[PDB]
Design a protein around this nucleic acid. Structure first.
Lengths: 46, 77, 271, 149
RNA sequence: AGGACCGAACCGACUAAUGUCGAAAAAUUAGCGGAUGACUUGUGGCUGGGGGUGAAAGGCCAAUCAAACCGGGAGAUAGCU
RNA sequence: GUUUAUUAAAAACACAGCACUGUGCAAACACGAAAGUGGACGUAUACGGUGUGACGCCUGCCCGGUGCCGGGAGGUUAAU
RNA sequence: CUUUAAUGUUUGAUGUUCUAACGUUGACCCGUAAUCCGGGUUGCGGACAGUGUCUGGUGGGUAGUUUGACUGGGGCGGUC
């Protein structure tokens, strides 16, 4: 039974990585929101 | 954008009312056109995206005067 | 030549093949090749704009010289080659100056044939001349819309146009659709008919044949649900509706030409 | 639109008369070509001051020079040898490029836009008449005899 | 030569039994279909919610789909319990 | 061959073939407030839509109604 | 006033021609080792096409909604 999550570091970084968020303004707002909440992990860091 | 380079006219949102007074959002667009104006001061043609009202404004005033105002506005033509 | 293959197995019973013995059995001319990446019917937005496109064999692009601007240079037909991008075969032609080029092959070409372009050219098939110098009533192909554009009419296998009249600076042509169009006399055209006239006799035989030609299955509107197509819905094959396109436009006899710009060049319409 | 006219307009030209004209006509033809200047309560005093007669002679000499130029070649004949086809079907149509260049090299030095062709583009081989307009009121006739080579 | 034949890997899931607080939020055992092709598969891309994709079942779109998920309008409204 | 991943694998869907219809190339059509892109670096022996569904015999009568195509005698008919 | 006609006025529909607006997904040159874009020369269309405001027609392509109660369950029928 193949499950939904099939890990891949390259796909994870290129999809939800820090640079991916900064590319668009919506991603920048995502980072801004999580800085405000004080989350330790801003994004998925390798 | 659909902005006249002389009068600054830009699209403005509004309503359109039917017989039953139903209101739906619409948008009014300026009558923009691309026109080439001959300028004797610089001896060449300048292309401006101007509305019909703006073209009347250019005729009433001078093309040189309008260009000076555009330059003072700070936007390249 | 048309060959009917024996029904050794289902999928071969209805296959009719077209075999051209004089086609080149080898790789094409590399300098005139270019990559042709498939699209699958998607546009720059990534959405499907044309349906039933996708898959198929990889095929490279041959730079076919439609303009034919080499005026005054005699050329010799080296060989004929199969072009995957076209219904008609192409011909590799070597000019007297050492330049090779690809051109559409009319019905009459064969290896070693002589062709010439420009106004100072003969009347044999394969020569390109301005339509002013082409005698009225002759058959031409690869006709130009505008001087130097390149050539857009009668490009498929076994296609041609008729020159019917010449008034002033404009010429009237009868297209394969039965429509009469008025074209400038300065436009060039190629004498003769496009070759491979038997290309229409193939039948492909089975479903896979159309599949690896780049065509995907077509689903009828009735088979779909109401939310997907204007047709569809109901139990037991109910239609009860006028035929329409998937986007609501009424098909099956509704004229969709709305140009008002090129109408001045149209003399008669299709009948 | 009330504008002052400088050049002779064939229909309504009267050397600076306050005559109405379509905005497009003045905007696209007169003003860009210098045939008129928009005057609105400011240039009327100026036109009657320095444009009233000072430029009248300046405008006239241009017509006088044009009249002199079109009589430079008294022969008024143009002969060009072209490798025409067999029994007609001239090699290729020729407009104003070649004929103007040949005339300029040996004949009247004239601009490209001056030459007008009323009989097509010289398709048939033989004698043809070409109307030359060096001025609005000055028309010239030139006979051209293309000879096959 | 073949969308050819028999048959493993591989892909799929026609029948039966077991299992239903299971070993498993669809599996196991014994049979079963395709198996050089309209095949299958690795890696990487593209299409985003009244939209996508669909050899078309209202199927699929992160175990959720006749309109996904998250936050907000929002303490929606509830002549009902 | 494909299909309801997880109760339906089928007569359903697709299919080669057939017919109708649109499209002359700045093509029809589609995605996009637009630019632009696909169709196609193709152009009527081509492309899109629709129905039927290999092959053999074939496919009759009906234009009232609703669509679609063409006409203009006459009537009615908006902004202005 | 009924009946008619020379020149001048408002004229509007129609037709022909022209180029200077405008279009050019025609060719050539330059910015430029650039199928974008811009400028220049020329060709072809040309006051057409196209676009804005207003307006008639079409418009389940899309959207918001409605589609009563009594009733020997409801529906049908009947009644108000």
């Amino acid at each position: 039974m193949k499950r939904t999550f099939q890990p891949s570091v390259l796909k994870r970084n290129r999809s939800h990585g820090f640079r991916a968020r900064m590319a668009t303004k919506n991603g920048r707002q995502v980072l801004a929101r999580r800085r405000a909440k004080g989350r330790a992990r801003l994004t998925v860091s390798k | 954008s659909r902005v006249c380079q002389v009068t600054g006219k830009r699209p403005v949102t509004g309503n359109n009312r039917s017989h039953a007074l139903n209101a739906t959002k619409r948008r009014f667009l300026p009558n923009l056109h691309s026109h080439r104006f001959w300028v004797e001061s610089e001896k060449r043609f300048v292309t401006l995206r101007v509305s019909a009202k703006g073209m009347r404004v250019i005729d009433k005033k001078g093309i040189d005067t309008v260009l000076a105002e555009l330059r003072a506005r700070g936007e390249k033509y | 030549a048309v060959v009917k293959c024996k029904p050794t197995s289902p999928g071969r019973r209805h296959v009719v093949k077209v075999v051209n013995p004089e086609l080149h059995k080898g790789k094409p001319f590399a300098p005139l090749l270019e990559k042709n990446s498939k699209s699958g019917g998607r546009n720059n937005n990534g959405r499907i704009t044309t349906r039933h496109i996708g898959g198929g064999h990889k095929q490279a692009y041959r730079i076919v010289d439609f303009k034919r601007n080499k005026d005054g240079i005699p050329a010799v037909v080296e060989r004929l080659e199969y072009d995957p991008n076209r219904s008609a075969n192409i011909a590799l032609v070597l000019y007297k100056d050492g330049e090779r080029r690809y051109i559409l092959a009319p019905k009459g070409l064969k290896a070693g044939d002589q062709i010439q372009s420009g106004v100072d050219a003969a009347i044999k098939p394969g020569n390109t001349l301005p339509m002013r110098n082409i005698p009225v009533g002759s058959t031409v192909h690869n006709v130009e819309m505008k001087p130097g554009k390149g050539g857009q009419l009668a490009r498929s296998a076994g296609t041609y146009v008729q020159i019917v009249a010449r008034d002033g600076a404009y010429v009237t042509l009868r297209l394969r659709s039965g429509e009469m169009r008025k074209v400038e006399a300065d436009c060039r055209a190629t004498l003769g008919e496009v070759g491979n006239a038997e290309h229409m006799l193939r039948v492909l035989g089975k479903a896979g044949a159309a599949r690896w030609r780049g065509v995907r299955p077509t689903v009828r509107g009735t088979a779909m649900n109401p939310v997907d197509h204007p047709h569809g819905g109901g139990e037991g094959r109910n239609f009860g509706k006028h035929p329409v396109t998937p986007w609501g436009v009424q098909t099956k006899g509704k004229k969709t030409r709305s140009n008002k710009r090129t109408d001045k060049f149209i003399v008669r319409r299709r009948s | 639109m009330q504008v002052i006219l400088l050049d002779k307009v064939a229909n309504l030209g009267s050397l600076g008369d306050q005559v109405n004209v379509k905005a497009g006509y003045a905007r696209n033809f007169l003003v860009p070509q210098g045939k008129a200047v928009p005057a609105t309560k400011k240039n009327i005093e100026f036109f009657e001051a320095r444009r009233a007669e000072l430029e009248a002679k300046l405008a006239e000499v241009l017509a006088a020079a044009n009249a002199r130029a079109e009589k430079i070649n008294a022969l008024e004949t143009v002969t060009i040898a072209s490798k025409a086809g067999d029994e007609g079907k001239l090699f290729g149509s020729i407009g104003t490029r070649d004929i103007a260049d040949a005339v300029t090299a040996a004949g009247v030095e004239v601009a490209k836009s001056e030459v007008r062709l009323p009989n097509g583009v010289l398709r048939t081989t033989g004698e043809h008449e070409v109307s030359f307009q060096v001025h609005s009121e000055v028309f010239a006739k030139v006979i051209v005899n293309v000879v096959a080579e």
